[PDB]
């Protein structure tokens, strides 16, 4: 439905496809950004162990510290998702 | 200049005023959100030890895991800032 565009990833490309998919699911289930973000953080906390953090929104800038190979930042249609492991 | 409104804080109110001030400085120096966020994260990494993470923007939702008494989420005029320690 929404065009996934990965803009920056320090992350195995298996995990990338999984990120993009887990976030497709979040957008199919939830309409509000904080609820989308919660679905992805909790799914990644489960599928890949903690501690992940997730920001979903249309206008934001970020600066964060993420364990190597545990960062991704992609759009889904207009909505941008930031997902990373402390 | 911009009206600070703290919307949620798990944080000593000393640190809260410092957060709000460090972010006032960021908005006086930088115009782009990722650059504002970088100024606050780095200043907090310095003034309070790592590891902090910072999101600055007008439209986003979040879900994150933060050490207790190391979270704040406030507006500055229209711009919302999220600052927390992994």
């Amino acid at each position: 439905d929404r065009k996934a565009v990965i803009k920056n990833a320090d992350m195995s490309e298996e995990m990338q496809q999984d990120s993009v998919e887990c976030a497709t699911q979040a957008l199919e289930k939830y309409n509000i950004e904080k609820d989308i973000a919660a679905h992805i953080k909790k799914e990644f906390d489960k599928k890949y162990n903690p501690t992940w953090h997730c920001i979903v929104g249309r206008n934001f800038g970020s600066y964060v510290t993420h364990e190597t190979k545990h960062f991704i930042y992609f759009y889904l249609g207009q909505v941008a998702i930031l997902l990373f492991k402390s | 200049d911009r009206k600070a409104v703290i919307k949620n804080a798990d944080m000593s109110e000393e640190m809260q005023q410092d957060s709000v001030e460090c972010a006032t400085q960021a908005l006086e120096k930088y115009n782009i959100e990722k650059d504002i966020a970088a100024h606050i994260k780095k200043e907090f990494d310095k003034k309070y030890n790592p590891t902090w993470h910072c999101i600055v923007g007008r439209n986003f939702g979040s879900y994150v895991t933060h050490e207790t008494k190391h979270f704040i989420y406030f507006y500055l005029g229209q711009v919302a800032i999220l600052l927390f320690k992994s």
Binding site: D10, A80 | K34
Partner: peptide
Amino acid sequence: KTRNSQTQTD
């Protein structure tokens, strides 16, 4: 190990 990252929405 750690690494720092920056993002900006378009």
